[PDB]
Amino acid sequence: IAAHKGVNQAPVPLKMERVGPHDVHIEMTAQITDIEIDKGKIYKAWTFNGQAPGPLVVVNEGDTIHFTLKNMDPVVPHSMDFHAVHASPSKDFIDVMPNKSGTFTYPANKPGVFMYHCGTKPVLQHIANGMHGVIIVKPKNGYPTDKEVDREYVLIQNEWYKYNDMNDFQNGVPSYVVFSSKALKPGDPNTNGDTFTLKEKPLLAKVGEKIRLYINNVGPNEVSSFHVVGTVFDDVYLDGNPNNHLQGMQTVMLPASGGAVVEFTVTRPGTYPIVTHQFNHAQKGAVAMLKVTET
Amino acid sequence: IAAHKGVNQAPVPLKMERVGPHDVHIEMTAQITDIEIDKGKIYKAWTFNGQAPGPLVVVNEGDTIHFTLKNMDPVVPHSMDFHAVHASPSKDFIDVMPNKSGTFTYPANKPGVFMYHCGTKPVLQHIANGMHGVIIVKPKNGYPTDKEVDREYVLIQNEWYKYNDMNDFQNGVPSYVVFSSKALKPGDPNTNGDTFTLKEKPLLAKVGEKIRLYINNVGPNEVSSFHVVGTVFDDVYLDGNPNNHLQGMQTVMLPASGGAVVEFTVTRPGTYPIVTHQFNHAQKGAVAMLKVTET
Amino acid sequence: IAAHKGVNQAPVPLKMERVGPHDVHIEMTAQITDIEIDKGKIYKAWTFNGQAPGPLVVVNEGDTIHFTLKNMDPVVPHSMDFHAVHASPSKDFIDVMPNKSGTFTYPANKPGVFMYHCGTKPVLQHIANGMHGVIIVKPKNGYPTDKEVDREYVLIQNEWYKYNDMNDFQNGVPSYVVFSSKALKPGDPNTNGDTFTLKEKPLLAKVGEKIRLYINNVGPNEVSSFHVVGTVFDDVYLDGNPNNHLQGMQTVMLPASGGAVVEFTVTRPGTYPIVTHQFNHAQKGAVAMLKVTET
Numbered sequence: 001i002a003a004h005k006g007v008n009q010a011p012v013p014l015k016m017e018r019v020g021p022h023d024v025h026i027e028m029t030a031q032i033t034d035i036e037i038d039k040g041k042i043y044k045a046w047t048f049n050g051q052a053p054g055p056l057v058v059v060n061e062g063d064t065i066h067f068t069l070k071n072m073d074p075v076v077p078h079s080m081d082f083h084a085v086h087a088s089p090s091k092d093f094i095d096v097m098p099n100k101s102g103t104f105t106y107p108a109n110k111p112g113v114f115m116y117h118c119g120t121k122p123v124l125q126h127i128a129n130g131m132h133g134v135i136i137v138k139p140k141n142g143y144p145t146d147k148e149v150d151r152e153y154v155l156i157q158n159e160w161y162k163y164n165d166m167n168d169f170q171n172g173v174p175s176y177v178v179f180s181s182k183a184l185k186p187g188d189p190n191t192n193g194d195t196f197t198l199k200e201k202p203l204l205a206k207v208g209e210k211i212r213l214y215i216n217n218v219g220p221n222e223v224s225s226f227h228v229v230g231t232v233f234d235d236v237y238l239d240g241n242p243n244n245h246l247q248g249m250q251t252v253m254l255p256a257s258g259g260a261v262v263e264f265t266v267t268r269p270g271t272y273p274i275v276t277h278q279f280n281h282a283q284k285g286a287v288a289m290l291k292v293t294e295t
Numbered sequence: 296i297a298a299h300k301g302v303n304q305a306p307v308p309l310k311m312e313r314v315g316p317h318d319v320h321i322e323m324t325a326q327i328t329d330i331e332i333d334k335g336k337i338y339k340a341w342t343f344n345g346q347a348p349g350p351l352v353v354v355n356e357g358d359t360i361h362f363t364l365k366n367m368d369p370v371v372p373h374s375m376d377f378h379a380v381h382a383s384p385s386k387d388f389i390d391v392m393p394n395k396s397g398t399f400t401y402p403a404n405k406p407g408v409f410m411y412h413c414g415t416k417p418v419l420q421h422i423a424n425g426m427h428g429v430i431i432v433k434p435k436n437g438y439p440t441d442k443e444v445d446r447e448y449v450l451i452q453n454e455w456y457k458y459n460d461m462n463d464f465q466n467g468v469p470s471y472v473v474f475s476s477k478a479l480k481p482g483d484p485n486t487n488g489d490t491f492t493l494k495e496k497p498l499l500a501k502v503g504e505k506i507r508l509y510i511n512n513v514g515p516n517e518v519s520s521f522h523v524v525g526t527v528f529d530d531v532y533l534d535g536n537p538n539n540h541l542q543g544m545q546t547v548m549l550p551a552s553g554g555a556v557v558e559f560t561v562t563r564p565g566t567y568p569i570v571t572h573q574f575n576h577a578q579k580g581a582v583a584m585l586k587v588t589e590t
Numbered sequence: 591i592a593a594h595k596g597v598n599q600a601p602v603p604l605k606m607e608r609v610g611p612h613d614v615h616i617e618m619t620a621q622i623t624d625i626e627i628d629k630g631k632i633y634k635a636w637t638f639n640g641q642a643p644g645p646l647v648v649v650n651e652g653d654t655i656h657f658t659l660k661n662m663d664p665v666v667p668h669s670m671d672f673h674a675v676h677a678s679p680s681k682d683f684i685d686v687m688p689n690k691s692g693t694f695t696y697p698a699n700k701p702g703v704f705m706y707h708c709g710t711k712p713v714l715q716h717i718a719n720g721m722h723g724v725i726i727v728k729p730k731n732g733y734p735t736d737k738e739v740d741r742e743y744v745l746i747q748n749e750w751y752k753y754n755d756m757n758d759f760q761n762g763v764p765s766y767v768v769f770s771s772k773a774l775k776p777g778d779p780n781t782n783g784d785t786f787t788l789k790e791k792p793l794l795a796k797v798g799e800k801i802r803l804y805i806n807n808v809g810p811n812e813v814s815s816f817h818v819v820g821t822v823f824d825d826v827y828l829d830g831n832p833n834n835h836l837q838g839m840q841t842v843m844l845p846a847s848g849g850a851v852v853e854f855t856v857t858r859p860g861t862y863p864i865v866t867h868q869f870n871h872a873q874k875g876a877v878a879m880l881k882v883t884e885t
């Protein structure tokens with residue numbers, strides 16, 4: 001795209017603030033940002049806030065979101081679809097033109113781990129170029145295993161294709177499949193979808209801890225066979241809904257856009273790979289590490 | 296196939312009638328019928344009754360089906376496999392020769408949303424050419440949420456490949472992936488698997504309604520990540536069995552041949568896309584619309 | 591690989607023995623073995639014990655495994671990752687060099703149907719070449735339907751690609767997709783992953799029996815849509831955990847590495863195909879048969 005040549009917009013922080021007991025304001029940007037998706041490989045991503053996947057949003061069950069999108073793309077319209085909410089797609093998930101803002105309001109009444117993404121036609125193009133992320137809605141009554149969990153992280157799976165190549169997007173295998181982590185608490189890593197960061201800087205934990213992962217596979221096109229090497233999932237809540245309880249799963253099947261909360265114990269010091277067990281995708285980048293130490 | 300050149304058999308209505316409290320007669324045809332699968336693209340489908348997917352069949356739990364297949368194909372044998380039933384495949388799902396009929400009898404003792412399809416070797420060929428559909432078996436005791444539902448429809452996902460090209464069927468990506476709807480009550484739309492009909496003539500509903508969809512992904516080859524934009528599934532019954540209850544799912548993973556009953560609320564007027572969230576498939580046709588109005 | 595040219599190591603039996611109430615010894619080999627994966631097609635597989643998938647291992651919930659791997663490959667290191675166990679991957683699933691042995695110890699505390707496989711980098715290469723199998727961990731308290739089951743078998747799904755071709759493994763469609771069966775009791779068949787054996791020598795059962803299948807899809811890359819033609823699954827336990835109960839499923843979605851226990855009734859004499867309902871994979875070999883007779 002001629003108007004994107006040489007464009008590399010610096011990442012802008014997510015803006016969020018609570019404005020009442022059941023209402024939150026969220027402002028994001030749509031922006032064009034170079035990301036290093038594999039060593040030596042730059043992708044001029046279409047992004048929320050200069051991150052791909054986008055920034056983590058966390059709200060409470062029953063929160064109404066007042067969402068603003070500031071579109072910094074010089075020439076392409078963008079939009080926002082939160083899977084967490086009940087909304088009219090054709091009134092609430094509409095396009096925001098270049099250099100304009102749009103504000104939209106909708107309720108998040110269901111707990112879980114939801115995908116969000118740009119909803120601009122062709123949606124495959126906006127997603128595949130980088131406009132995806134997760135919103136967590138925390139359950140009013142928690143999860144039944146909350147008292148058991150010692151540490152938590154968020155992981156997101158996505159794919160990368162040939163740059164802005166709609167033929168590749170529709171008909172081709174992914175070039176890369178990757179994990180990222182997004183921060184829940186100060187000090188947590190916050191990364192983009194790449195083949196290397198979570199290998200080189202593993203997630204950290206302590207021997208004997210029960211770990212919770214909020215996970216979502218944003219696609220755009222592949223399903224995920226989510227597995228942590230060296231353990232078994234004690235508890236799995238599908239889409240992060242506390243009712244959809246499974247126990248003792250070795251691997252969790254996630255559809256494209258599918259989420260889960262998964263919990264497992266690390267019993268011994270060492271490094272634990274986290275994979276999709278579709279090993280073609282793992283080989284093309286979708287392996288993260290969890291380093292477990294005596295401290 | 297030389298004997299199919301210029302053949303376009305008019306659709307024949309499904310024949311069904313109840314012959315006792317727990318017994319139903321169903322007659323279908325196998326027939327060769329031109330279908331417009333995308334704008335300007337005709338596929339000379341192998342079909343049940345001149346529809347692809349085939350006509351909707353609905354029975355009650357505990358019904359014995361007395362099924363007749365009249366084979367109008369001039370040269371290819373066909374057969375019928377209902378996933379709803381307990382039968383001997385090698386006695387009950389056998390071939391019916393060109394210009395002959397065969398009658399078969401078997402019980403449907405499990406509630407759900409089942410695939411049916413031709414069972415003639417090579418089964419991939421008969422399925423991919425169009426010989427697929429759904430049979431719904433209604434549960435004796437209903438679903439626990441029956442009192443909440445205001446409107447219902449049936450949706451079916453299937454793929455189309457290069458015409459009668461076994462190499463493509465086994466090794467290639469789908470050319471099109473599509474939704475159809477089949478009628479449950481008078482006035483409901485009844486359509487074939489194409490890229491456009493349910494965009495141009497959306498399914499209809501009223502603001503505030505709880506909608507039930509009976510869904511099945513007949514394949515032949517792809518899994519489905521079933522999602523309705525702008526809502527969250529309140530309740531999901533996997534394969535349509537009332538026992539397999541999930542709640543608050545953003546997206547439902549269906550295997551090839553997999554079914555579900557899903558329920559959701561539309562809270563605001565507008566148009567709600569219904570997609571598989573494998574966006575390569577959505578881009579190749581698998582987007583339907585639900586138009587929700589104040590009336 | 592020059593050092594594998596002309597190498598065809600005879601299969602070696604699995605060695606297992608119980609050494610206390612909650613401790614078992616298992617010795618396996620890593621070895622290079624020609625397998626006939628389709629008629630006329632030999633694959634010089636990388637294997638455990640000269641079988642691909644490898645030998646069946648069955649333990650009890652709460653058993654500690656003392657596992658020995660003797661590496662007979664003249665030049666490639668191998669390792670073992672059991673999904674059943676809690677272990678440190680970086681201490682317990684490490685490489686055993688050519689012509690050496692390694693011993694590792696870890697607990698199997700969760701019941702189910704687990705994948706095992708070589709964990710040597712690149713893991714896709716070791717898996718795709720044949721280093722996969724299943725370990726069953728029997729639940730302390732059984733399954734709730736145990737009293738209903740008349741006969742049981744184990745089935746495993748895997749794929750084959752172009753020989754040792756990492757490009758094909760990562761980016762290409764499978765050449766073959768296949769079932770095998772592994773023996774639970776004397777007289778049960780024990781086969782390798784091929785396109786023909788379980789067609790030519792079907793699994794056997796008696797009219798009216800409730801059949802249990804322990805199943806796992808080891809991949810490396812595909813998901814499975816597991817279906818038995820002519821019946822409906824009465825009960826499904828996901829990953830073989832008794833808590834993850836589903837009922838009346840026509841087809842079970844298995845991720846790559848995913849397992850299940852499934853139970854169904856065969857009501858009439860005949861031959862019942864067992865398929866993945868991704869029919870491209872079925873056409874490329876993934877059809878087994880169950881022959882059901884009056885005796």
Ligand SMILES: [Cu+2]
Pocket residue numbers: 021022
């Ligand atoms: Cu309040």
Ligand SMILES: [Cu+2]
Pocket residue numbers: 019024025066
């Ligand atoms: Cu506000």
Ligand SMILES: [Cu+2]
Pocket residue numbers: 030046077078079118119120126131
């Ligand atoms: Cu966009």
Ligand SMILES: [Cu+2]
Pocket residue numbers: 081083115117257522572
């Ligand atoms: Cu979406």
Ligand SMILES: [Cu+2]
Pocket residue numbers: 148149150208209210
């Ligand atoms: Cu703890």
Ligand SMILES: [Cu+2]
Pocket residue numbers: 316317
């Ligand atoms: Cu009666």
Ligand SMILES: [Cu+2]
Pocket residue numbers: 314319320361
């Ligand atoms: Cu009759």
Ligand SMILES: [Cu+2]
Pocket residue numbers: 325341372373374413414415421426
């Ligand atoms: Cu046919």
Ligand SMILES: [Cu+2]
Pocket residue numbers: 376378410412552817867
């Ligand atoms: Cu079938």
Ligand SMILES: [Cu+2]
Pocket residue numbers: 443444445503504505
């Ligand atoms: Cu209502």
Ligand SMILES: [Cu+2]
Pocket residue numbers: 611612
């Ligand atoms: Cu004891």
Ligand SMILES: [Cu+2]
Pocket residue numbers: 609614615656
């Ligand atoms: Cu020992």
Ligand SMILES: [Cu+2]
Pocket residue numbers: 620636667668669708709710716721
């Ligand atoms: Cu190996």
Ligand SMILES: [Cu+2]
Pocket residue numbers: 227277671673705707847
């Ligand atoms: Cu593994």
Ligand SMILES: [Cu+2]
Pocket residue numbers: 738739740798799800
């Ligand atoms: Cu019995």
